[PDB]
Amino acid sequence: QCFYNESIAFFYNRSGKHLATEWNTVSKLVMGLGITVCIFIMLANLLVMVAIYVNRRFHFPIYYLMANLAAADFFAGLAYFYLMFNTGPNTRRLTVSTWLLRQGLIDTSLTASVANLLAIAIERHITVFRMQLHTRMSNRRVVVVIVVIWTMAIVMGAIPSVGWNCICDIENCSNMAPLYSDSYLVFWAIFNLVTFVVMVVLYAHIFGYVRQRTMRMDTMMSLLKTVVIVLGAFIICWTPGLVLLLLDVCCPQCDVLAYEKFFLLLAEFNSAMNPIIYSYRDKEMSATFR
Amino acid sequence: SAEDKAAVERSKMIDRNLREDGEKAAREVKLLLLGAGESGKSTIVKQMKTGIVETHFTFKDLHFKMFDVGGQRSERKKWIHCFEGVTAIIFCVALSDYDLVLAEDEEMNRMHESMKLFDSICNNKWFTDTSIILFLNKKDLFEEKIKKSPLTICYPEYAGSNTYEEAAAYIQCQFEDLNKRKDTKEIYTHFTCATDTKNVQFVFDAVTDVIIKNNLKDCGLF
Amino acid sequence: VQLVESGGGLVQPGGSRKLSCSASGFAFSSFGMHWVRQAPEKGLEWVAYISSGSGTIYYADTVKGRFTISRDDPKNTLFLQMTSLRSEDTAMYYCVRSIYYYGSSPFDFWGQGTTLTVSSSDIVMTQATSSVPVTPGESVSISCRSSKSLLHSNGNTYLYWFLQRPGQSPQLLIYRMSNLASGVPDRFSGSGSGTAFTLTISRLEAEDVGVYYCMQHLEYPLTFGAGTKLEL
Amino acid sequence: ELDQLRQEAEQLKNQIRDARKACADATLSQITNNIDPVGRIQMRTRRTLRGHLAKIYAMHWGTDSRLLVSASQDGKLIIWDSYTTNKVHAIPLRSSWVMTCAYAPSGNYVACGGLDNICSIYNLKTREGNVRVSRELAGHTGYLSCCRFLDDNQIVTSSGDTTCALWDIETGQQTTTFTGHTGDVMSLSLAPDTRLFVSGACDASAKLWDVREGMCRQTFTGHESDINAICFFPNGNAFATGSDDATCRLFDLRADQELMTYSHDNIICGITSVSFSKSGRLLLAGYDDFNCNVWDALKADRAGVLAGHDNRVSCLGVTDDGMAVATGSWDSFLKIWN
Amino acid sequence: SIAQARKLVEQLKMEANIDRIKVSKAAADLMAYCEAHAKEDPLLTPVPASENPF
Ligand SMILES: CCc1oc2c([C@H](CO)N(CC)CC)cccc2c1C
After folding, report:
1. Does the CB of D130 have a partner CB in chain C at under 8 Å?
2. For residue D176, which of A5, B200, B215, D166 is within the disulfide window of CB 3.0 to 4.6 Å?
């Protein structure tokens, strides 16, 4: 028993999400915040990429992953911008395929951003734990990890558009995304969780190694501050959203739709903050920004 | 052609060996050794194990190449750039040269000559980022000398008693004040210890410290 | 700088025997090795080849899939595996070394070879002269013909020359038209163009009497020519 | 007394300088006033030779204008095939600190030297396929700055001990020692006829020497800094010097004076290597600005630049037929330009 | 250092005792060498790609 001939309303009205035939003051305010955040994201990521490409000095693998992170955050800003202007009364002109396109864009962009953060953590670990001075390295590994990241993001954004959605199992699926199955949300949340814990472990190992070896002989304070901010931005801007998704897929009668749009806004503010977190420490890279 | 195909195969065989040799050489740590004639560089080299003298030694799974270029006795400005890219510069100065004078000049202190050389080296354009390991040798003989002779002979201004701790600290701090790149290169000062063999360990520790700091630099985590 | 080969002997048809050559006195690992066989009464014939590092292996059309050639650089040895020997495989098997880089002289040193007696699209090099009478001192010219232009685009005419004195291995004289090998008198000289080739000797002696061979190297399988014996 | 001889010595300089003035009939720029400039010499990288994994300090073409050797701080001496870019040989050096290269005119030998104060000579046309070291010339007390084969048996070398020497490779002893320089000798260039050679020293002076007799014939005074490069005009009747003063100047042996100075106000770095063209109409110089300039030796106008190196151009050479120019650099790449 | 002074004065004496030609004729000689071999200088005048080994 499946039904793809039905319209948007069939799933919205059976899960709880309001169609919003007319605009709302809360909708207007959240819309303004979202559009401002999206513009900031696009601007910052464009600056990051332009700086990373203009200077030949910033032509090394870490800056390459930095630029890929900037591009992923730009894509996330675009996806959030497109999600806006398709809500309130604009979420009823959609169809199953077009709305799936919207949600897949969002999913792929966010997955790419998170994967880029993890890849940066891995490359920092690799660089820190090497025991050579110059080590002129190749650019093949960076592009290989880049293609892995992008392929994973695209496949994650496409899987729900193909077979992992509740067009067939109407009963068991989400309340915020009326078609996405609870299984899909759980999978995405767990992917985010393992990514975050791997980042934490890698940065803790870097910090411990540096601390022991250098104190055998302040850099510790700066390293601790950088680690703390890079982890803190992630945890503060994702935990609400991930917990909200888990509540949707787990808690019956948990009103999670009112606190949805703001939490997604915070998740996108994460991508807004990434270009500044990973560029403030670089004096020269911050000097070409001026 | 068949001959050309074989030649290209030979050239690729050569390229593979060149890459392997380069990868083996990149793991080696290159150290430059400087100082005056009697500083004690020879004693340091003996501890670690014409023209340019190379010493190869392995410590804690790290391969070190030390270049004693003190037997050159020509203009340093022409061949010093050849050492750009070394991990560090081990610099030796004899604390027992404060009351002495070179056998040639009239009253130019040996210690001031060492200071002149150190100022020339640490501010060199080729070593802006290169760290310097400063060894201060003959410390016990310096203690014996200072117990009887005054430190004012070398430094006209000195506020401190004729005690080894304070005199040695003053000389050290005076030497660490020559570098203007305070926030780019780090001067690691050590007092030579004969039996403990801690000189090679100190060189090791300084080398790992600079390597770790460079690793944090190039990865953006600092 | 000697090269010595082992094996051979008497083998019944259908058997498989292994030929080995142990190199000594030079950098074997950087030399490409060949195998050349000579019939009891006919000329030479290339069979196999390995490049430096075992990166290219070629075979002759008459042994393709039947012989296997391998080299062991650490011990400086060259191997040949022979399978299901036919009656047409009776020949003395030589081992030749060669190195290919700009200006080198391939096929410069030949081994002594081993005798094997079994119980019981290709360029053709033609020299229809045999048993030419001659005398020490006089000037003699040996002629060779090819069915293809050996002059490559890069300007090299890959025609070689060899001399096999009675009871001795072939010895290189000219590694490419108008070039002279190392250790050979200056009397020997060869000039040619396109497909017509000549080898000239100003004055000869009793030492340089024997059968002369011609080989091309433009493309495999390195076809030889028939012998040209100087009578005396 | 010392003062007697010094006052006497400075009087000889007076005669030398006065004679030099008397023979300065006209400046070369005036004589070449009607010569058409060479125009913009746009040269492009035709081959890029990769495989050196460190700075390059010396290169030298072969007499066949196809093979060339290069040395680098990685401790490798590579013979290139410029036509096909495939490596003919890769010679490991006993000392990684090498500052000069040489390719014997017969092609049978190459040489190199540096901070070890030894000139190692390698035999290429052996009978074992490998390249082997033939002789080690150890008689200098300062690092080796240059070396050039005269024959298969004679090699002349300059050192930073203020002396140049002439060697006999078979015996390994200095047949002659050339002394008189007050500063480190940076480079030497052999005359086309192999009868004389000039050397430039850190004392800012260039001396013309006699290989046979062993005495200096002339000394040319010029700009006050280390002369870093020197090369003969192809006729052997002149030479050009490049020093840390960011100037290249053209001296003459017959006139015993200075003709041109190749300086541009924008250039403030020092010249690392110089070399001429087959006709001597282009003076190519490798500066420290990461680029190599091409100078019109007869008009003193910078007409041409070779900007493809991330670092300073250490070495620079032309072929015997003048069909190509190769340049090494601290960026570890040699580029064939034409 | 007295012998050094004597050798220096003799060195300069030998240096001064050489024939010097007018710089104009030497400049003409350098120009002559440049122009006589000009058309055989590949760098000065380009050679067509057919005869260009590179
Ligand atoms: C992760 C924070 C978050 O993401 C939401 C989505 C997107 C739509 O592409 N998907 C849904 C799995 C997860 C990225 C939709 C609705 C609400 C949310 C919230 C809250």
Report:
1. yes
2. D166
